[PDB]
Design a protein around this ligand. Structure first.
Ligand code: TJ9
Ligand code: TJ9
Ligand code: CL
Ligand code: CL
Ligand code: CL
Ligand code: CL
Ligand code: CL
Ligand code: CL
Lengths: 154, 152
């Protein structure tokens, strides 16, 4: 385990801990992780943080009725770049009618970037992921961690 | 100058966040490093190294959240860490009207030249600890003058 590999693993654990905490509490969340496609244009629409990753900061951002909780958090490598960001809303006809704006935004950014977006439903606490225009819903924590590990490789 | 404009933006962010928390009576503890290094206390909290904004400061201190207990420590115009430990003053002149937040603020002000702002969770009153003294029930004008004196 090189320092970079360990850093990546700590970031993955930080994400999965935060998502699990919010899922249990029905705390709605929208977390977009930059991959190879730069997302500066969307990062600039939010509140700049440029912060180190922690599960604690991720949770604190999404607490309901707070300044930062609406909109997307966008992450870069080992960084929380900005919160309350705008994302394009998908027009896909495959987006279930019972889903929220968070899901429409996550699929939207996944259609025009190679990013990975995680969504926590404030209705059910269910966890979903948007990638390449596809939305995969009702993920177990095992499924989420394995997705992140597969996606962080490259 | 760019530095000066950055400083005033930081002061405005702090004062807007403190005003918000005072109105809601949200307890808060914010220490700003000056010439005495505070790395030993920064290391006790959660690393952030985050840009200052009123929004982030508010989100940190929301009650019953991971980051709300402990001190935020600011250094070099950034939020270095949250949920940090500070030394509790042993002064016999701190009123028992005041909380652990205030005793920690006075304590760090006894061993550093930092400026610490405290919002009371009971009254929303704003105080500042500097050089071992605690200045209570501050107006918005007095807090801004203190921060301007401190950043100059
Ligand atoms: C064109 C447009 O409207 N883009 C949006 N993006 C995001 C991330 C939004 C949002 C609103 S409330 C919430 N939790 N997330 S709206
Ligand atoms: C020895 C010791 O414990 N020092 C402390 N520092 C800080 C900043 C504290 C705090 C603020 S709010 C809360 N519940 N605790 S206790
Ligand atoms: Cl970019
Ligand atoms: Cl939702
Ligand atoms: Cl779901
Ligand atoms: Cl409170
Ligand atoms: Cl908590
Ligand atoms: Cl208090």
């Amino acid at each position: 385990p090189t320092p970079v590999e360990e850093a990546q693993q700590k970031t993955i654990e930080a994400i999965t801990k935060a998502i699990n905490y919010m899922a249990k509490r029905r705390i709605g969340a929208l977390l977009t992780i930059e991959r190879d496609t730069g997302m500066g244009d969307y990062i600039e629409t939010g509140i700049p943080l440029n912060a180190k990753v922690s599960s604690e900061l991720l949770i604190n951002i999404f607490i309901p009725n707070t300044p930062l909780h609406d909109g997307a958090v966008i992450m870069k490598n080992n960084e929380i770049a900005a919160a309350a960001c705008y994302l394009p809303l998908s027009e896909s006809p495959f987006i279930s009618k019972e889903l929220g704006t968070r899901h429409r935004a996550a699929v939207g950014i996944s259609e025009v970037t190679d990013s990975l977006t995680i969504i926590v439903s404030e209705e059910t606490g269910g966890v979903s992921v948007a990638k390449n225009g596809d939305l995969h819903r009702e993920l177990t924590e095992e499924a989420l961690k394995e997705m992140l590990e597969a996606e962080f490789k490259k």
